Design a binder for this molecule. Structure first.
Ligand code: RZS
Length: 165
């Protein structure tokens, strides 16, 4: 189904790809969003996925927050995948740039175990400020379901693969 991924472990795969383009092509059952507790999809993966939905993700997310309140750091919710996937699993990894606890990254990845297969970014990486090498390590040590990681940055992808233990 997913093409061109490098197998890291029994269940973790990685590719240098734009997660928006991966989602449009594959139309996976689940695309993971690098969400914040307010589901305000301003930038990074969230801003990019929301822009690909023509803001439908943000409109749906605002209604979800109006009804349910904010998510917890380390938590998630399942919403529509719009034109990108059947569902979007909005997962909140800790944002180290907001001083959040990096220990919550394992809790964030545990949300992936509720889905047999997912297309996902590295949680807390990019604008969330965590070390992406550490994120990949927590991913491989926490996620047991099939996760296809899309890493937008080629230089970061090369660093992640070449340093993977
Ligand atoms: C070009 C649109 N796609 C993407 C994918 C990932 C990120 C990040 N971070 C930003 N844009």
């Amino acid at each position: 189904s997913f093409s061109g991924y490098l197998k890291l472990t029994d269940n973790v795969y990685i590719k240098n790809a734009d997660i928006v383009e991966e989602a449009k092509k594959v139309k996976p059952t689940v695309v993971v969003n690098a969400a914040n507790v307010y589901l305000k999809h301003g930038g990074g993966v969230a801003g990019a996925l929301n822009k690909a939905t023509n803001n439908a993700m943000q409109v749906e997310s605002d209604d979800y927050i109006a009804t349910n309140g904010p998510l917890k750091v380390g938590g998630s919710c399942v919403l529509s995948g719009h034109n990108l996937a059947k569902h979007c699993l909005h997962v909140v990894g800790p944002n180290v740039n907001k001083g959040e606890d990096i220990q919550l990254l394992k809790s964030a990845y545990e949300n992936f175990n509720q889905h047999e297969v997912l297309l996902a970014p590295l949680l807390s990486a990019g604008i969330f400020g965590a070390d992406p090498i550490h994120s990949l390590r927590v991913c491989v040590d926490t996620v047991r379901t099939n996760v296809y990681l899309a890493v937008f940055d080629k230089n970061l992808y090369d660093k992640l693969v070449s340093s993977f233990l």
